[PDB]
């Protein structure tokens, strides 16, 4: 209840040291990575020392949040693999 994760992830998400590197998707409920590249280089380490994107996934979801890599109907998706929105639950 309340950990420590989920309390740094209010100021990450916000604009702080990111500041035009990640925003929400519209009002919560969704986070999106416009530049993943950016991010992770000079974004991922800058809070968790020396973790990878596959790290910063893993403590979404024993916390609650979770990643997205399906392929129910996307008219033209699975087309990029820099960009993509992180669901808040995905399945349960």
Same mark, same amino acid.
């Given at each position: 209840?309340?950990? +420590?994760?989920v309390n740094? $992830?209010?100021?990450?998400?916000?604009?702080?040291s990111?500041? /035009?590197?990640? #925003?929400?998707?519209? &009002?919560?409920?969704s986070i999106? !990575?416009?530049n993943r590249?950016?991010?992770?280089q000079?974004? $991922?380490? /800058?809070?968790f /020392? %020396? &973790?990878?994107? +596959? &790290?910063? !996934?893993? =403590? $979404?979801?024993?916390?609650?949040? #979770?990643?997205? =890599?399906?392929?129910?109907?996307?008219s033209m $998706?699975?087309?990029?693999? &820099?960009?993509?929105?992180?669901?808040n639950?995905? %399945? +349960?």
């Amino acid at each position: 209840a309340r950990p +420590a994760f989920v309390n740094k $992830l209010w100021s990450m998400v916000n604009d702080k040291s990111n500041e /035009k590197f990640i #925003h929400w998707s519209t &009002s919560g409920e969704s986070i999106v !990575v416009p530049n993943r590249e950016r991010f992770v280089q000079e974004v $991922l380490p /800058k809070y968790f /020392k %020396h &973790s990878n994107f +596959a &790290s910063f !996934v893993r =403590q $979404l979801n024993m916390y609650g949040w #979770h990643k997205v =890599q399906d392929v129910k109907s996307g008219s033209m $998706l699975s087309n990029n693999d &820099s960009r993509w929105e992180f669901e808040n639950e995905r %399945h +349960a």
